[PDB]
Design a protein around this ligand. Structure first.
Ligand code: HEM
Ligand SMILES: *[C@H]1O[C@H](CO)[C@@H](O[C@@H]2O[C@H](CO)[C@@H](O[C@H]3O[C@H](CO)[C@@H](O)[C@H](O)[C@@H]3O)[C@H](O)[C@H]2NC(C)=O)[C@H](O)[C@H]1NC(C)=O
Ligand SMILES: *[C@H]1O[C@H](CO)[C@@H](O[C@@H]2O[C@H](CO)[C@@H](O[C@H]3O[C@H](CO)[C@@H](O)[C@H](O)[C@@H]3O)[C@H](O)[C@H]2NC(C)=O)[C@H](O)[C@H]1NC(C)=O
Ligand SMILES: *[C@@H]1O[C@H](CO)[C@@H](O[C@@H]2O[C@H](CO)[C@@H](O)[C@H](O)[C@H]2NC(C)=O)[C@H](O)[C@H]1NC(C)=O
Ligand SMILES: *[C@@H]1O[C@H](CO)[C@@H](O[C@@H]2O[C@H](CO)[C@@H](O)[C@H](O)[C@H]2NC(C)=O)[C@H](O)[C@H]1NC(C)=O
Ligand SMILES: [Ca+2]
Length: 595
């Protein structure tokens, strides 16, 4: 039942038995087997990959290979017939801030990235795909239905190259195909610091001995810092406005500047790392660079662990939260670190949470400027709206005071993402995140919805009437059925996101199971977990759960009016309060009095 050890695309170099902070790459968290959770290793399989040829082809690849006696529908038809909607009225989430969506994507990026297969960038690999719409090797183009307005206006297809798979990249052939996770399965801030050695320290300020990350030198935000600029041309943040020529940011994670709000979130994270490094030299004048770096990094990771598990997860998981993440009993080391392949698809529930616009608010939380509210599709890899139009205070206020979108079975993904997405190399604001999501479950060889329901010990439908009952929705089920003929063929992605949301959560059963199980695991199998006895000192620990995303906002921006609960729905004058009625992270318990 096999496959014992294909551990090729990694340099072997072995461990350090203390090295008091994690390794940048996540290796050595686990002692018995070293790799478990290391970046650039293969996403785990909770179930046998399901492919056309049982090996590598994605269902929907060859015309005449039915999946269970039926042809699978095009991702874009699944998209145009179920996922989109016209009316953005009544779509907001009365009880979740824009920050709710923001943190998700953030946490998302810390745990998993399945990079596109490069396999040649001085090739037609590119032209043959978008330009001529030919399917081949890694060019798995998203074809249009007919009746699809994009026919009359963009062409015959959208681009979609398959994902990086392991062992080589060069073409395999004899047992299953496994995509890679290019970040550390651990919730460890890899998004700020890096997941490769190489990138850790380009992000670092080695030039001086204090322990901070390189901050921008071309530009400032009040007295505050800006992530360091990114090196590579072609740069997409340069492509939306060729006139402004402001490049994308440089961070531990590569997708940082997807949109203005994540870049923004990413900026709060760096300042906090530098902030943590001054207080420390201050207190421990003798500790060297490395030490204020790993110990900052060390607090920063802990911080991200508590907001996510103490503030975010109970509000995504809702009632399903204890059932999979009963409280902390400490490090089990048999537990698996590895982000699972399906998690990478389950976590994209967040796509239903992005609204169609973003705002900039001023000190009384009102339209900062004339053109303050903007269409999301004008913010993709848009960095200039930050350094040349107001800094991040304005945007953090929108994060604090606007609302997320709410999944609606009749309004799944907003057209800013569904018909107008921008993709780093394809010049038009014309793509679709829904179609792409669907083409990819197949690319990753996902098992259908019922395999996953079975797996979660959930009932599995086989008829319209059955599918209806579970989705508590009749025409959704009727549409779903007409495209798929059997719920067995439904792509895990839309399949899981069509299920009503649980009590007090924001995802359904299927997803709460898949989600819950993963996080339970990245926490229990994490050797550097902040509660993990010994990992922290006890006061150092009483200092920590006093941390808050509201306080994160004060220490690092000139926003002096915050909400006690950053993720809940918050309106200004009212749910706001000055920053001084706020819990600070007191660092006197880190004080080394080696004198
Ligand atoms: C405006 C905001 C966002 C945009 C424009 C966006 C767009 C995209 C795109 C194009 C992909 C490509 C994946 C593929 O091709 O298969 C992706 C993946 C993903 N996004 Fe979205 N996303 C956004 C927000 C979020 C948020 C807010 C979350 C979490 C709460 C999130 C979680 C993910 C995850 C988990 C993936 C798969 C990452 C992997 O490979 O491990 N994203 N996003
Ligand atoms: C890409 O960024 C450009 C450069 O920042 C941007 O132009 C700048 O933004 C607007 C253009 O409409 C102007 O803003 C306003 O400035 C003050 C108050 O903001 C007003 O009194 C002005 O009349 C003007 O409306 C900036 O002056 C302008 N700067 C420059 C050098 O053009 C472009 O709009 C962006 N291009 C695209 C395609 O997005
Ligand atoms: C909808 O969203 C609110 C969250 O943004 C939601 O609030 C959460 O509801 C639970 C149960 O009412 C409350 O529980 C927390 O407080 C109790 C107090 O005894 C503590 O023992 C627990 O630790 C628990 O965390 C919370 O007040 C809240 N949870 C948190 C962490 O904030 C509201 O029901 C709705 N909001 C509105 C505006 O109606
Ligand atoms: C590494 O840290 C030092 C200290 O902040 C940076 O040098 C400072 O640069 C700012 C202005 O750019 C001024 O405060 C001084 O010129 C320097 N201050 C001190 C206290 O030395 C150095 O440039 C940093 N490098 C990066 C990329 O962040
Ligand atoms: C450590 O994690 C492992 C793997 O997740 C757990 O293994 C369980 O242990 C039971 C004991 O009878 C085995 O039969 C099964 O393989 C697993 N069953 C269940 C329900 O988990 C184990 O529970 C964990 N150990 C600790 C100390 O938490
Ligand atoms: Ca990580």
């Amino acid at each position: 039942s096999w496959e014992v050890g294909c551990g090729a695309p990694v340099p072997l170099v072995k461990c350090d038995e203390n090295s008091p902070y994690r390794t940048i790459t996540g290796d050595c968290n686990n002692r018995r087997s070293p790799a478990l959770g290391a970046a650039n290793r293969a996403l785990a399989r909770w179930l046998p990959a399901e492919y056309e040829d049982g090996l590598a082809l994605p269902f929907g690849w060859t015309q005449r290979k039915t999946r269970n006696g039926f042809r699978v529908p095009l991702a874009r038809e699944v998209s145009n017939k179920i996922v989109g909607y016209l009316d953005e009225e009544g779509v907001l989430d009365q009880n979740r801030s824009l920050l709710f969506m923001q943190w998700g994507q953030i946490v998302d990026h810390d745990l998993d990235f399945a990079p596109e297969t490069e396999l040649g960038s001085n090739e037609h690999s590119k032209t043959q795909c978008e330009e001529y719409c030919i399917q081949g090797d890694n060019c798995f183009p998203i074809m249009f239905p007919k009746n699809d307005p994009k026919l009359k206006t963009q062409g015959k297809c959208m681009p979609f190259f398959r994902a990086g798979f392991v062992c080589p990249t060069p073409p395999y052939q004899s047992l299953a195909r496994e995509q890679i996770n290019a970040v550390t399965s651990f919730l460890d801030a890899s998004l700020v610091y890096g997941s490769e050695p190489s990138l850790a320290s380009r992000l670092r300020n080695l030039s001086s001995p204090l322990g901070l990350m390189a901050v921008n030198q071309e530009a400032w935000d009040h007295g505050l810092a800006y992530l360091p600029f990114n090196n590579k041309k072609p740069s997409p943040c340069e492509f939306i406005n060729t006139t402004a020529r402001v490049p994308c940011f440089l961070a531990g994670d590569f997708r940082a500047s997807e949109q203005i709000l994540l870049a923004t979130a990413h900026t709060l994270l760096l300042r906090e790392h530098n902030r943590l490094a001054r207080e420390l030299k201050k207190l421990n004048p003798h500790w060297n660079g490395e030490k204020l770096y790993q110990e900052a990094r060390k607090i920063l990771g802990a911080f991200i662990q508590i907001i996510t598990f103490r503030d975010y997860l109970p509000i995504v998981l809702g009632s399903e939260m204890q059932k999979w993440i009963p409280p902390y009993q400490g490090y089990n080391n048999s537990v698996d670190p590895r982000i699972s392949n399906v998690f990478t698809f389950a976590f994209r529930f967040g796509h239903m949470e992005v609204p169609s616009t973003v705002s900039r608010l001023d000190e009384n939380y009102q339209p900062w400027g004339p053109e303050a509210e903007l269409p999301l599709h004008t913010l993709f890899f848009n960095t200039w709206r930050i350094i040349k139009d107001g800094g991040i205070d304005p945007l953090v206020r929108g994060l604090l005071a606007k609302k997320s979108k709410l999944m609606n079975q009749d309004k799944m993904v907003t057209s800013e993402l569904r018909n107008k997405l921008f993709q780093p190399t394809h010049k038009i604001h014309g793509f679709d995140l829904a179609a792409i999501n669907l083409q990819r479950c197949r690319d990753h060889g996902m098992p259908g919805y019922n395999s996953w329901r079975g797996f979660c010990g959930l009932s599995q439908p086989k008829t319209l009437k059955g599918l209806q009952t579970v989705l508590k929705n009749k025409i959704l089920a009727k549409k779903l059925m007409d495209l798929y003929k059997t719920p067995d063929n439904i792509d895990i992605w839309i399949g899981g996101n069509a299920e009503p949301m649980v009590e007090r959560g924001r995802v359904g059963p299927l997803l709460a199971c898949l989600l819950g199980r993963q996080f339970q695991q990245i926490r229990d199998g994490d050797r550097f977990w902040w509660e993990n006895p010994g990992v922290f000192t006890e006061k150092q620990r009483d200092s920590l759960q006093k941390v808050s995303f509201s306080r994160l906002i004060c220490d690092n921006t000139h926003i002096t009016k915050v909400p006690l609960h950053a993720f809940q729905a918050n309106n200004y004058p009212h749910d706001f309060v000055d920053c001084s009625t706020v819990d600070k992270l007191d660092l006197s318990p880190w004080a080394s009095r080696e004198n």
